[PDB]
């Protein structure tokens, strides 16, 4: 399991934790296979917290998984947000995971609860460190569109 993200700032590579959480990673894998992540804006960027994105609407809402609306999150003990670069999922309830995800920029130990951890960024962390310095308006949203040109899975 391995996905490249051709982002505007640079190149992002992710290795999926299929052995830990298989159900929540296969959707991302086949989703990059389908590749509607083309032209998807990283609508949320917070200095030292996250970079969220993945909704075709671009309005900070929406996003359809392969199951279609949502699914069940699986979390176990050894998973932690101890670093900066853990690739996790975005939800709005108990089991409300959608197609959109986010990348961690600082240890968020308080967040190892309702959020599924299914990735680690091996290469391109400098791209995320630069994304942490992107011009952002009053709300947590970049002023210029931070589109993903392509997402090729390998």
């Amino acid at each position: 399991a391995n996905v490249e993200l051709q982002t505007s700032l640079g190149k992002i590579l992710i290795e999926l934790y299929t052995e830990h959480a298989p159900k929540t990673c296969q959707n991302f894998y086949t989703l990059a296979k389908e590749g509607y992540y083309d032209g998807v804006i990283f609508h949320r960027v917070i200095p030292d917290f996250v970079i969220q994105g993945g909704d075709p609407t671009g309005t900070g809402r929406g996003g359809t998984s392969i199951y279609g609306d949502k699914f069940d999150d699986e979390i176990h003990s050894d998973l932690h947000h101890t670093g900066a670069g853990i690739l996790s999922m975005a939800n709005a309830g108990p089991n409300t995971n959608s197609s959109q995800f986010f990348i961690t920029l600082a240890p968020t130990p308080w967040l190892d609860g309702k959020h599924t951890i299914f990735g680690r960024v091996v290469s391109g962390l400098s791209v995320c460190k630069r994304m942490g310095l992107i011009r952002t308006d009053s709300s947590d949203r970049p002023i210029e569109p931070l589109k993903i040109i392509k997402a090729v899975a390998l």
Binding site: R130, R135, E144
Partner: peptide, 21 residues
Amino acid sequence: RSAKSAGNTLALQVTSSGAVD
């Protein structure tokens, strides 16, 4: 860490495979 946007966003790899913009 509080640096905020003190500089222009670094040039983007455009969708036309242009390495830098």
